Amino acid sequence: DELDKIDLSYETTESGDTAVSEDSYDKYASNNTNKEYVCDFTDQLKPTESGPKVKKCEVKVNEPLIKVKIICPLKGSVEKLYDNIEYVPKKSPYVVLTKEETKLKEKLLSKLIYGLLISPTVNEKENNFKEGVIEFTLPPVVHKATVFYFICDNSKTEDDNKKGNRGIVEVYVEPYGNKINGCAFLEKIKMKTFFTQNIYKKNNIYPCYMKLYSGDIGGILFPKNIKSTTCFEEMIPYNKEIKWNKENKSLGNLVNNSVVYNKEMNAKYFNVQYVHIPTSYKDTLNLFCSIILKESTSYLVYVSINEG
């Protein structure tokens, strides 16, 4: 592809071309709102006489499934304040930067954290600084601490005696979680080390069967030759838990205040879907769903919540 092509010769630093030391950095916290960690640079990179200063957005991750939002105003958002702005890496958040020694070089995030969702469109518009903002939703588990950076530099812009600043976002991920209460339909290891059950194509015995409780999370790694899936769009119960509505089959229509991620499977790197159980859901429920194949050869999946 071209949206993830990395320049192996690229190099840069935190201070960039400002000669500033890490101590003089203006480190601040992200405005987090309902599992959404935010780094807004609109009112932070405005030129100042005392510039070019360096503002650092700290992002500390010790929890799962944080929707990350990063802002880097566009050239001309204000008439003259961002006339010479630069955001790096260009093809973000597909491409990111990691600290090799003291300098930085390009790295692919999907190749660094498996199971991360990067919807190519935010508010109907592309997911790139060209449209002014970038988003991405984290995975539910991480094995090793991962640190990468973003860049949003307005220092090259000047408003008479004032000068813009160099914006940077540091993401210090801490090891959280262990595995997924889900199934794995089958470089390649991170597929196997993330689920409790593995489902092989040629000869499978047990179908998918993911067990859940109140406040736990599960997921699925859908196959490579998938035709369709109904495991969060159309759920069906069996035996006798509750009288069934033939239309309230979407996971959102089944449990109030439930969550689904990548319901449309539009993510670029992986064909995956996730869910979350609110801490207020104390009702027991057991459901079923199916999956399709290109061949119709279908697999099945089971769901159990608070089954105790």
Side-chain angles (χ1 to χ4, degrees), residues 138-185:
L138 283 177
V141 169
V142 167
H143 290 315
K144 304 171 173 180
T146 310
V147 175
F148 58 106
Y149 301 105
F150 280 112
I151 304 292
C152 175
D153 181 22
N154 202 43
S155 69
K156 290 175 168 64
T157 319
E158 301 184 76
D159 176 63
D160 50 271
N161 57 345
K162 309 175 184 176
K163 312 181 172 66
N165 298 325
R166 180 183 184 81
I168 303 178
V169 185
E170 173 162 330
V171 179
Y172 184 73
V173 177
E174 299 180 352
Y176 66 93
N178 187 9
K179 273 174 182 172
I180 300 164
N181 294 294
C183 305
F185 301 82

Side-chain angles (χ1 to χ4, degrees), residues 50-226:
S50 309
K53 288 170 172 170
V54 165
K55 301 186 145 274
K56 189 194 185 200
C57 200
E58 285 188 354
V59 180
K60 301 172 172 177
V61 170
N62 66 322
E63 302 171 3
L65 298 167
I66 301 305
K67 184 166 179 176
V68 170
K69 200 177 188 176
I70 287 169
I71 308 175
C72 189
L74 301 173
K75 188 204 302 302
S77 52
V78 181
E79 277 297 339
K80 290 180 189 297
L81 297 183
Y82 310 108
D83 288 8
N84 292 142
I85 201 175
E86 295 173 349
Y87 50 78
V88 177
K90 288 276 175 269
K91 297 168 183 180
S92 296
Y94 296 147
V95 185
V96 300
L97 296 166
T98 65
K99 195 180 277 170
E100 307 191 357
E101 305 186 357
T102 52
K103 294 187 174 65
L104 315 176
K105 292 200 157 187
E106 287 191 332
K107 294 279 240 174
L108 279 174
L109 183 50
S110 59
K111 180 176 146 187
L112 266 67
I113 311 184
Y114 186 87
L116 190 147
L117 295 174
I118 299 172
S119 173
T121 64
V122 178
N123 304 348
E124 307 298 347
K125 295 184 183 173
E126 188 174 358
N127 182 331
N128 183 285
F129 293 111
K130 291 175 179 183
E131 297 295 325
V133 69
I134 53 157
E135 286 182 3
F136 67 82
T137 312
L138 283 177
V141 169
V142 167
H143 290 315
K144 304 171 173 180
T146 310
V147 175
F148 58 106
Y149 301 105
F150 280 112
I151 304 292
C152 175
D153 181 22
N154 202 43
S155 69
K156 290 175 168 64
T157 319
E158 301 184 76
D159 176 63
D160 50 271
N161 57 345
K162 309 175 184 176
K163 312 181 172 66
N165 298 325
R166 180 183 184 81
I168 303 178
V169 185
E170 173 162 330
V171 179
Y172 184 73
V173 177
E174 299 180 352
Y176 66 93
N178 187 9
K179 273 174 182 172
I180 300 164
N181 294 294
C183 305
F185 301 82
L186 314 173
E187 198 284 337
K188 66 176 80 160
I189 295 149
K190 305 185 185 177
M191 316 181 185
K192 313 180 178 181
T193 66
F194 272 11
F195 295 89
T196 55
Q197 170 163 98
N198 296 341
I199 304 302
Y200 305 95
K201 181 175 175 182
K202 197 152 182 178
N203 299 114
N204 186 42
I205 301 171
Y206 315 94
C208 179
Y209 174 99
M210 77 177 178
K211 183 178 192 250
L212 310 169
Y213 284 88
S214 290
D216 283 332
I217 289 166
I220 299 167
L221 167 57
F222 288 88
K224 299 172 281 186
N225 303 128
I226 185 166

